[PDB]
């Protein structure tokens, strides 16, 4: 019908649009030698006591980018069991908070077939929950990642344009050399719709796609030959030791650093690092080794990648680039010293009692799809 046309370099102009024929071209045609290697560490799913101390151990206020600012990560947060005081504190420390739905609905077919309204309830609803119970008023919750990385055809992106989300990070790009840079959705995707029965958008949408390049899981990138890539780090099932993880990180860093310097995505679930102390040790060791030996590698949020694409800065220019210095090295105190611990209930989650921690007063019932504020109000007809 109204299929989005292939990239038209003349109609797609920075900073509101970026594309190339195959997605490998550097924004602003900076040469690769001069592009800061951006790394986006992300954490999925819910934030609470299962992982709050893990994040403190990683983001300890001593690991600094070459601009002297704390390294930054992005959290795609799902609602259930989340501690919204901790979300608020993570945001205060300068990490990005993005939405990963209210329900994390088990059924992969629901996401691939959901209506525009369904996507809004899950994603715009989750934004409402974060903005209220984490008291975030600056409109910085702008990203979306769908549970199980199930893309929602055009409906997901229609929803996101209507709801004024900045970017999506659900679409996977197959293992490619060179890997792909982010792209906007005004023009046709520069790669195949990848994954089992995925339903990808086909029309124009005013949405950034922080594409998820599959990583190369091969233990010997020369001799071994064909193995499918993996998007989530913890879904590379052959990574069993700290050493394998360490080499895996070096190999895929080199794939990006020695080619087009496309942002390197390291997407995790909090448990995979916590439940395997060998993986956490190799990860921290690798981060420290990369930070010490590189003055041209930046650990940044997803929003911060987009801000660079909108105004590309050389490695030399990067150290005074203002968007990358927002909340540089935050100390101060939490928004509240002892959060309320709300023991809450809802007809929408029948039977369960769920603790929601927040610096706000406890709401009347547990926030869910049909009542994201937890106010118990009767909606109008
Ligand atoms: C929820 O998260 C908050 C924020 O990290 C935790 O708050 C800490 O609570 C202790 C003891 O109540 C206080 O002494 C600290 O000042 C709080 N820290 C911050 C940064 O606010 C809280 O313990 C968490 N609760 C649960 C159940 O996960
Ligand atoms: C949100 O934070 C601001 C700034 O600290 C504070 O003035 C306000 O009371 C908070 N809002 C709520 C509802 O607690
Ligand atoms: Zn998830």
Author numbering: 162 to 542
What's the publication's text?
Our experiments showed that full-length recombinant BmCDA1 was not stable and underwent autocleavage when incubated with the crystallization reagent. Thus, the truncated form of BmCDA1 (BmCDA1-CAD, residues 162–539) was cloned, expressed, and purified for crystallization. Diffraction data were collected to 1.98 and 2.4 Å on native and SeMet protein crystals, respectively, and the structure was solved using the SeMet single-wavelength anomalous diffraction technique. The overall structure of BmCDA1-CAD consists of two regions: a CE4-conserved NodB homology subdomain and C-terminal loops. The active site of BmCDA1-CAD is located at the top center of the (β/α)7 barrel and contains a metal-binding triad conserved across the CE4 family, namely, a zinc ion coordinated by Asp206, His261, and His265. Taken together, the differences in motif 4 and motif 5 confer BmCDA1 a more open and wider active pocket. The substrate-binding cleft is shallow and open when compared with the other microbial CDAs because of the lack of several loops that give microbial CDAs their characteristically deep and narrow substrate-binding cleft. Our study showed that the deacetylation activity of BmCDA1 was undetectable toward various chitinous substrates even with prolonged incubation time to 120 h or with higher enzyme concentrations at 200 μm.
Carbohydrate esterase 4 family (CE4)2 chitin deacetylases (CDAs, EC 3.5.1.41) catalyze the removal of acetyl groups from chitin to form chitosan, a polymer of β-(1,4)-linked d-glucosamine residues. CDAs are widely distributed in protists, diatoms, bacteria, fungi, nematodes, and insects, playing vital roles in chitinous matrix formation and modification, as well as in biological attack of fungal pathogens. In this study, two CDAs from Bombyx mori, BmCDA1 and BmCDA8, were crystallized and resolved, providing the first insight into the structural characteristics, activity profiles, and deacetylation mode of insect CDAs. The structures revealed that insect CDAs possess several unique structural features that distinguish them from other known CE4 enzymes.
